[model samples]
Target: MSLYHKILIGFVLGVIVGLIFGDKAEFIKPLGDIFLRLLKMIVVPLVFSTIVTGIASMGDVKKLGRIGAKTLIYYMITTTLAVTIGLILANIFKPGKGLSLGEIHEVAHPNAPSFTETLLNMIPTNPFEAMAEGNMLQIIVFAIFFGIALALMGEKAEPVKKFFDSASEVMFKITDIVMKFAPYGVFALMAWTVGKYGLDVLAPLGKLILTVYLGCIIHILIVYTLLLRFLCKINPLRFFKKIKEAMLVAFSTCSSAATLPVTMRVAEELGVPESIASFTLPLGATINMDGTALYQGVAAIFVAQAYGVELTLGQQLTIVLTAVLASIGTAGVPGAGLVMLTMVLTSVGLPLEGIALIAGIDRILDMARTTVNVTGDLVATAIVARTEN
Candidate 1:
């Protein structure tokens, strides 16, 4: 069987085993953790090298301007549409209607860095420090600057450019080697997640889960498909088929950052130019939170309804705006969704305690959302690549 088929089978088998074993599947959870670490091990170096070389490879300075502007605009439009869709679905489904309060839960809000701070933080104080800390935004900023400098240096920078080009090639070979373990890794992750969470946890918040999952599906089919068709002018089904590896990795890991390596690999395999895939995917991972934004919209409204607080049209619009901004500004870390959701809820005068209700099932929703986020990143890359060509 093909690798994709093997991965699919492993995923199905994992769900079966986890359902049968419940929490006992914890024994195999380490397998997934090891795989994740393997993938992550290459991220910083791969991103830095690939992006630097990719950018340097761009001969024209003006091309960077054109591509960057197009990328950001696409991200904004798609993310806004995603959040709006989530709000519409939440309003129609009313997932939070009439749930009995279990108890008053304490919510400690982590202060989100200000917009200015977020922009400033992108410029790393020390490049080595940023790499060691796995600060993606800072690393990306530094890479772009370094790449631009190299591009301007012409012949003087050829040796450095060659070095990074070779390093990027090595990293991709490493990616290929690491992906051979994906079936085992995917299987372990799904098994542990299902076993630990179980079917029972999903029963209470099925509506909310269904809403988010369905929202992601709709966003992919409608928004992404249309973009691929009308905007990118590529075969949507062919693109989807090529990206299954990245999608599976994102779903199992429930992290866009962790899935970055695979996404880049898939993007390249799908004929995305290195410069576009490298620059766009890394940026997409950081800023494009389509799935997370969608979840935030549904979650914010769900909380308001549960608390018996009626939100006005203005407040709902505020949720959309807050979600879009939060998606852009928040750190692309695991559990950042909960923080963004808190920000959205607080923006509209909803109780923070409502988060406690959904907290138990957050992981279930996270898997779906992360998958969508990665898909958005690839779609953006493809569109930009097509435009550039």
Candidate 2:
């Protein structure tokens, strides 16, 4: 077995140890933090260079455009539907309603940007500044333009593109080398998480966690798996197994950007053409978020119920619309899901103070959400391969 598997074993063992030792096991978490930083160190270069080189060598701007358009449409449609499903499910299941309103704490407005401002901000001023600030959308934008520039320059671009290609390869090799220590990282991450958290971390919001996770599982199984199997003509289980490392990395680091290199590797192994995976995967990582949108839907309704707020059908529809749009607007922003969720809640006129309730468990939810995010990216690649012109 690879180091990834061993790390998984260590993570499981650490969880058991955590249950036994509790807070004493917190020291192990730094190991996972080290791995996360390692991944973060390479994420920008790996994604930008790999994507730009892939597009430059392939020189398929038209295809890139087509794929991008289809991808945006797909992401929007799915996210809208997902949020709608969450609203509907919440109405029916009433997971939040199960909690006593007397038990819920009230808070003031959650400071967040307006949807319009967030949307407009997608266009970056200085690409270099974007990269320096780790603005994912800006990095993605620069990579696309740089790729096209090299394509236009023809042979002159070859050397530069080749350098990125070599760099991408080296990065992958480095990731592989890093994976050798994955067990230590996994153990540390889990131990710290579980030890510090203990069982009580789940005490107040157990239902909330259960509801969101349940909603996520149902969405993945019924929506993502079915879509891949029938619509995309792919095997969902095979796909998941192929991308296990990427999924685990996503779960471990809780950042889709951090998992990009591994995702690209998984895409290639799953038979996604290099041209398709390179352009589509990075862009998808930056923008595609069917899972986060779904989580937003569940969370929104959960918050509303807990706060004793009633949303009209029209307002609920607005939640769906806003969540989908916000997914695009906040795609690569740091802690963007929260920002998008805040947008969704504000659109429905819900108290922003509910954000604090959700924030308490955001770290755990992030792992689940990013796994869905990456899975959604790969699924988009498959669909693009089949359908994009």
Candidate 3:
């Protein structure tokens, strides 16, 4: 069987095993942990070498501008669409209606850096330190800087650029080696998650849960499909099938960071020029958050309703704006999904305790949001590549 088919089988069998064995599935958790460590081990160097190589070899400086600007523009417009769709759906379904909730759960508000701090933090004081810390935003900034210098130096830097070119190739080869174990890793992860969360936990907040799932579906189906058909001029069905492996990783891991290796591999396979994929996918993994933004939209409105309060049209508009900025503001922050949601709730005077209502099923929703996030990254990569050609 193809690797994709094997991974899919692993995922199905995981759910079945979880349902059967309950918490006993935890014993197999180490299998997934090993897989994640393997994925993580390659991420920093992979990003550094690939991005530096892609940028240095790009030749035309203006082409770099074209790709960067296109990525940002695509992310901005699509994030807005996602959140607005989320809000509209929540408005219709009223996920929080009459299901008035209680419980004052402690929420740590990890404040977003000020705009200036966010900008300053983009550049690494020590590039090596950033790599050690696994801060992708800083790492990306340093790579772009290093690459631009090499791009300008021409023949003098050709040898240096070649070194990174070979490193990039080696990193991807290592990615393939690690991914050989993905079926077993994914099986353990899903089994552990389902065993712990259980199917029963989904019952209490089914409406809100379904709302977020539906929102992701709508965003992917309507927003991404339209972009594929019109903007990328590719077949949507073909696109999804090609991306299935990446999606599976994202879903099981519930993390864009963890899924980065697979995303880059899929980008390469899709014929996304390494120059574009290497640059955009890493950047997208850092900042692009369509799914997280959409979830915030639903949570914001859902919380207001549960509190028996009404939000003005103006307040909802504030949410749209906050959600957009939060996507960028929380880039590279650990537990970014919650941090973004915290900012969204705080911006509009929603009670922080409302977070308690959703915490129970956060993992289930996380899988959905993280999947959309990776999908958004790849879609942006494809469109940028198309436009550059």
Judge candidate 3 at residue 306 and give its lDDT.
78
Q: Give the poorly placed runs of model 1, Cα more than 4 Å off.
A: 102-113, 327-331, 343-349
Per-residue lDDT tens digits of candidate 2, residues 63-170?
A: 778877888887776676567667767787765675544344433333344677765676678987877888777788888888889877887777898898899888
Backbone clashes under 3 angstroms, per model: 0, 2, 0
TM-score of each: 0.93, 0.90, 0.92
Higher TM-score: candidate 2 or 3? Answer: 3
Candidate order by TM-score, highest to lowest? 1, 3, 2
lDDT of 1 at 368: 87
lDDT of 1 by residue, 298-372 (tens): 887788777766577676766556455655645477776687767656655556677877888888888988899
By the lDDT metric, which is better: model 1 or model 2? Answer: 1
Candidate 2 versus truth, CA RMSD in Å, comes to 3.1
lDDT by candidate, in order shown = 0.83, 0.75, 0.82
Residue pairs that clash (backbone atoms under 3 angstroms), model 2:
28-188, 29-188
* Model 3 misplaced regions, further than 4 Å: 102-113, 327-334, 343-351
Task: Determine which window of 10 residues in candidate 1 has minimal summed lDDT.
Answer: 102-111
Error of 2 at 320 (Å): 4.7
